[PDB]
Design a binder for this molecule. Sequence first.
Ligand SMILES: [Cl-]
Ligand SMILES: [Fe+3]
Ligand SMILES: [Fe+3]
Length: 674
Amino acid sequence: EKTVRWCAVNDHEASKCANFRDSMKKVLPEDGPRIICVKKASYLDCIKAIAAHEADAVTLDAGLVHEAGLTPNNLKPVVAEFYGSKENPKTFYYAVALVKKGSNFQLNELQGKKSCHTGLGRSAGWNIPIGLLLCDLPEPRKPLEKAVASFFSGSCVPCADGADFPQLCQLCPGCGCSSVQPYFGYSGAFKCLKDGLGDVAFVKQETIFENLPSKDERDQYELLCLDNTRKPVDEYEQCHLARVPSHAVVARSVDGKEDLIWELLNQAQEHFGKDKSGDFQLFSSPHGKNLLFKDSAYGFFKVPPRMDANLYLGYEYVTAVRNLREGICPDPLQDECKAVKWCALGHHERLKCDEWSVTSGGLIECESAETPEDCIAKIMNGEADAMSLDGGYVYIAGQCGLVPVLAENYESTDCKKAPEEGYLSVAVVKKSNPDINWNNLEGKKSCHTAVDRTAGWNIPMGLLYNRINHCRFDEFFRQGCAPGSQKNSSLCELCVGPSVCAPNNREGYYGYTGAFRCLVEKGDVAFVKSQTVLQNTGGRNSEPWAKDLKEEDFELLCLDGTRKPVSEAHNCHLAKAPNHAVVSRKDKAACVKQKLLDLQVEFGNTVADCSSKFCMFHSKTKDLLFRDDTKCLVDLRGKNTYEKYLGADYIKAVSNLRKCSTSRLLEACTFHKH
Ligand SMILES: [Cl-]
Ligand SMILES: [Fe+3]
Ligand SMILES: [Fe+3]
């Protein structure tokens, strides 16, 4: 029926797997997924067996999760171990350098020493330590193994090639890749030190605790710290090499059976987890330590579906592993600010970007994606560097670790001005329609810039939420067009653009303008910025649908139930909305700034004609890359943080709506517990 083929790495893992199977069989229903144990010689073979459908699941160290996610294997993390305790869970652990008390040497005296590692490519045992020594390893750092093999005078590096790099197997002939050889893994590394083969062991902070129950034995060991002092093994908080992410169970990217896997594992932990006691324990075993799952784990968390490997790992870890395999050293270097790569939605923004590229002489580079969230993801993982975003998306970007760099200012051409307090957010209706008002929306037809945008969603939806106290907005309005919503909800029923309901330009009713047109053609209410009516009436917008429209044909909804002319936003708006802002990663914020400020000098408001020369803030269509009413990109004057830039009030408002999010990227960015 439903089977999970679990991949066990060699014999001891095979025996634990069998006990696991049989035990589960007792507690699950005759359908409940059943385990099948497939035995392979190494984690690598397991990765391959899963790609090829021979198996479905294997728990791996984060460094190997990175390996498993590459082509052509393409696997992804779907369940994660957590540590610490049930009530205060952590999805990271510490890499430490473990030594014997009294051997005296510090972190900077490893050259020549003998080393014990958990395995090639693993976080604590290889990635972190080797990554700190890299730059000062023997100049020909390729291949890495040969260099590491000359720096230490003998090692145990499970999984490495002993044929070509025999020194890496001096302390463990064969470099066997499984718990069948005694010096493998967290346990083996520890043993390699304890038996005196090696002088140092690269493990995690629990290792010594899980192998030596009494403080008095543990008193024989110390940790090496980054400042070249030693500290007792209890003080790992102040004397670790790095924090690294959790070990995770990986599965195929498509047809991986993640649901089964999660079902099994969730039940497994309900029955055989750390609290329970029994003949079978999931985090323990008489056949060894860290079999199938780490003994130090306290349970699992379902990994958010949007999260792939890079995202699961995060940017610093991934870059660290990247560098290492890429022999890139950041020795006393200078100037990564060659060109800024911009992320563009859909076709049009791409075209505009290309144009901006050519003309800059490649100072601006273009990457593209089909959604705002995908663009933010690209930037998170350095596939791109920068994009401009509405406040609502700036929130998501911030929860995902990006920072605001420069704000779009709409009120003045003096680019040295501080960022404005924000634009006005209004609700607009047709004068034709006599009955609609603020207190009347239930039932009507609505138009929104996009889900998650400030004027189109966050402001109006949150203010309505505080009224209806539930989240089925698609049941409050009868019908709508709120791009980025579920293809088959009511809220997509008014959309039109080729790509129906997409959160981009391929949806006609997308954006400030799109939502206005939506109002003109099918809706009863549009949620947009205050300047929208003016920008699209009076022949200022020459499209057929708007050329003859008149400002006088529309009104605004005031919170108090009344209606007013559009010229009255100031006294008849929903709220203020922080200006759109440019985002990047901390690493590249400065670069990004400077190149934007400079490019603005030749391509900003100043350009007298935009059909002759290139204009950043001018768009062939509407609002490509920047808002067309953008005047200046102004420095943030200390509001270099998304909480700081958006401001309390806005944060407080978006938070109140947290429970209705449907953002896959936001759940992803909020999974890790640090
Ligand atoms: Cl291990
Ligand atoms: Fe690990
Ligand atoms: Fe906006």
